[model samples]
Target: GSGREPLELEVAVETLARLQQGVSTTVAHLLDLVGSASGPGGWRSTSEPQEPPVQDLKAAVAAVHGAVHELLEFARSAVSSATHTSDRTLHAKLSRQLQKMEDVYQTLVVHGQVLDSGRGGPGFTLDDLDRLVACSRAVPEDAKQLASFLHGNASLLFRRTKA
Candidate 1:
């Protein structure tokens, strides 16, 4: 990972940014769905349930979860590959970034579980969604810092490989 020429950091950063944005949008949608499903005029019912809005929300969250898992895996691979090379500077920077991303992933996992439990679980409040949004915003910054470091070392390392 470190022995090769610097990898193209721009593409990697862009990919991460897109993925982060996707997660943010998904979170927003999830909030909206939960709001609609749990409200008074929402999907409430007793005897015969009509539209299962909760199911829809779960599906959306699952989709986003799938995407996020893939992205995180890719990030791990990218950092691992880079670390194997001789570029100590880039390697160290990527390691820090990867660690931060892992933290973000863990946070998401906890919040995701909270969401999955639905109203019966931890109860999705506006505050929870706001916190999730804040976490979402941190992803791109971590990616950007890593990308900038990679860019600086690009000339010495190998060409950027597909992230």
Candidate 2:
């Protein structure tokens, strides 16, 4: 087996993780969808034609929405189950991270609708690219923080994989 720390700790990690995975996945997928359907940077470029990838854009936006919703559900579940001091601390930290993710989701949806709806073409706009880049960078840090916070503890009350 490899000695490298998966850079990822493995459940309850699931809570913070689902958003990290989903948001990043959507951005990566959007990169492909935009590149193929529109152009690499539809924001600055004017290569957009009359018929852009509306369906695909809609689907991508929907995926982002779904990720946001998934996190909302997870947050609600965690709030309910968190009873201990440590769990509550984790929950508080988790809340801040979730909001960061929500911002990422909202930022894209705000602009993506414009790019996708009328006729932005297959590529992403510069604005969209900017937002996506920001989102991509934020999540990995959250993952590490959550993992370390959990690992910082010695309790099995909240289980985690090692770094």
Candidate 3:
């Protein structure tokens, strides 16, 4: 074997831990923001009681978008570094991941703007908040999926080195 040291499993673990923590914090913040924007206690509409909290919701969504972008960048770099020896496969996987992230970002951007405008009139109702929560859940799922994939690949690589 080459004199180069084997991949550091601890580094991978630490990196993943950090990523998970960041994602979790972002998700929690999003939930709080959504909660604040919805309901009678939130930023209520001046004209219509049924209107959603468009501006506040939009800001929250925008924050999520930013976090997603950061996560995507981190994933791309991690995958690229891990799979550097396999150029074709690495590039393909990274490209696919980036595209998927971009798709979600675009959706959030457009929808966030519409929501910010308060399409109907005022703040959102409890039902609207529920929908937002459901959608926000997807963010964590995406982060977890990427983290799992990277962690699994790194573990396998390390095991091979030991053998």
Quality of model 2 by C-alpha lDDT: 0.54
Highest TM-score against the true fold, candidate: 3
When superposed on Cα atoms, how far off is each prediction in RMSD?
A: 6.3, 9.0, 5.9
Model 3 alpha-carbon miss at residue 146, Å: 1.2
Q: Please rank every candidate by TM-score, starting with the best.
A: 3, 1, 2
**Span of ten consecutive residues with least summed lDDT in model 1:** 45-54
lDDT for each residue of candidate 1 in 21-76, tens digit (9 for 90 to 100):
77667656655665664444546556424334546756876766666665666465
Comparing 2 and 3 on lDDT, the stronger one = 3
Residue 144 lDDT, candidate 3, scale 0-100: 75
Clash count for candidate 1 is 14
Model 3 weakest 10-residue run by lDDT:
154-163
Worst 10 residues of 2 by lDDT: 4-13
Listed in order, each prediction's TM-score against the native is: 0.56, 0.51, 0.61
> Model 2: runs farther than 4 Å from truth?
1-25, 37-50, 85-88, 116-163
Q: Assess each prediction's global lDDT (C-alpha) against the native.
A: 0.59, 0.54, 0.61
The per-residue C-alpha lDDT of model 3 at residue 88 equals 54
